[PDB]
Every structure is written in C-alpha cells, then in structure tokens.
Structure 1
Amino acid sequence: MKTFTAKPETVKRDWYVVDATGKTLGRLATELARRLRGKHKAEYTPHVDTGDYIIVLNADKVAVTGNKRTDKVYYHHTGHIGGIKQATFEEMIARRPERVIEIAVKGMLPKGPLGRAMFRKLKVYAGNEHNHAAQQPQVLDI
C-alpha cells in the first residue's frame, strides 16, 4: 500500500517552555531544532511541519565553553559594498540577546519555506517572563 503521511490540517502541536540558563548554546540548539522540525514524533513527515512550539526563556544566560564568549564572531554583509559588519558573542548578547539563539537554531533548521515555517514556531525571550501563558506551555527539561 502507501506509507502514512501526516496531514498538515490534522497535526497536533504542543507548547513547551525551556529555560536556557547555563545550557551550552549549540547543544541546546540541536534539540530545539529537532523538536521544531518534529523529528521526535512517530508521524514525522519531511514535507510537513509537525514540530512543537517552543518558548526559550533567559536567552541572555545561554553559556558557551572555551573562549567563544569573547572570540566567536557573527559576520553579516549589509549588501552595500564594503558593508561587512561583524559582532562578537558578548557584544551581540549585550545588544540583542535572543538573536544568538535565533541564529543558532536557524542554522540547523532546513533551508526553505518549510524551514522558515518551522522557525516561526520558536519564541526566544531575553528575560524570564513570557506572554504566552494562554497556551499553557509545558516545562520541557531539555
């Protein structure tokens, strides 16, 4: 016959909350991307976003080993000639802390419209309070 494929209208998505304090950046991010993609479900389907909404708290207290704190360099080109801006991990934590986690996870999620749809399901917060108490997020002890 034909192998079961999940149907996007009938998928079930849950809300988890993960406190990212003291965790290692990349080792948190791999699990975040796994659960955003839905690789932890029996009905995983490559062309269906079956993942779970995840809310990352305390995004400024993520930890990195070694000297990566003052030596990991986030490059990006504005598109104007000569506009290769860069910012170290500590500067980027200071200015826009949640972008660190966001880039960490966006690099691991697949590239494409489905990957963007998956990354729409990740909520990264600098602090500890999160708006989405209405969705009853589950404590996900990653």
Structure 2
Amino acid sequence: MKTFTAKPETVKRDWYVVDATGKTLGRLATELARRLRGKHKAEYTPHVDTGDYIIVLNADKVAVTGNKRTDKVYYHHTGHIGGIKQATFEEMIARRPERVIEIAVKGMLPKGPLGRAMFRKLKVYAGNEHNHAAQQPQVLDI
C-alpha cells in the first residue's frame, strides 16, 4: 500500500470569524498560523494547502505586555543609500492598525509560493464590521 495524499481539486474549506479585543499578540498569531496551514486536520500534507478562511475583527485593540507599547521598533530599508526607517508600536497602531497582525502572522508561515498562497486567506479589519455575510462564517473562540 501507498500512503494517502490529498488533492487540491477535492479539498474542503470553511469560514470562521474571530475577535481580537484584549488578546495577546503572539499567542493569537500562533493559532492563526496553525489553522491557516492546516495542521489541525488528519488530512495534512506538506505540499498541499488544506487550510481554512479566517476573519479577524477589532485589530486596533490587541494587547502587549511589559513596556513594549512604547519600546518595540519596526524597521525597514527603502533601497536607496541611507534609507533606513523605523516606527514604534504606538505609531503603527495609530496609522496602520491591520499591519501589526499581518506582519506577525506572515513571520510564522512557510517561505515560498505555497506560503504566499496560504497568506491570501486572512482578512483583517480594524473595527467591528465586515461585508462577508454571504459566506456565513461561524464564531471561533481563541
């Protein structure tokens, strides 16, 4: 006998909705990455995507511990000589709240075409409303 392998043409996926108000950033990101990759199903296969769709609400109310709210720095370089730039957690929350969760989850997925594909199933919002009622998501408690 040969071991079972899943097929991209016949996999099944489902829609969940989550609330981030007051949760710890990293300990929520781990769960998001787990369920986007599909490690919780018995059909898991490293070279196929067998994950689920997840909506996240209230991204501007996520929490951190310690003195991180004023001391965690995000960096990036623009490609021009001398172009190194930075921002703090508070600043990032003020201008681009969704990026905070997006960057953290993107760091915990596999690197390559399949990982970039897995990232496309995540939908992050800043308030308490979404426009995906036609898909009928179910509430997930994390």
Same fold (TM over 0.5): yes
- SS at the partner of 2:44? coil
Alpha-carbon distance in 1 for matches of 2:3, 2:82: 52
Q: CA deviation at 1:49?
A: 1.1
Q: CA deviation at 1:55?
A: 0.5
- SS at the partner of 1:10? coil
Q: Stretches of 4+ moved more than 2 A in 1? A: none
Q: CA deviation at 1:85?
A: 1.1
Q: CA deviation at 1:81?
A: 1.6
Q: Name stretches of at least 5 consecutive residues in structure 2 with no aligned partner.
A: none
Q: CA deviation at 1:106?
A: 0.1
TM-score normalized by the length of structure 2: 0.97
Alpha-carbon distance in 1 for matches of 2:120, 2:7: 19
CA offset digits 1:79-105 (Å, max 9, x no partner)? 122111111111001100000000010
Q: Give the paired residue count.
A: 142
Alpha-carbon distance in 1 for matches of 2:41, 2:83: 43
Alpha-carbon distance in 2 for matches of 1:69, 1:140: 27
Q: CA deviation at 1:53?
A: 0.6
Q: Name stretches of at least 5 consecutive residues in structure 1 with no aligned partner.
A: none
RMSD, matched Cα: 0.7
- SS at the partner of 1:18? strand
CA offset digits 1:117-141 (Å, max 9, x no partner)? 1110000101110111111111110
- SS at the partner of 2:141? coil
TM-score normalized by the length of structure 1: 0.97
Task: Report sequence identity in percent.
Answer: 100
Q: CA deviation at 1:29?
A: 0.2
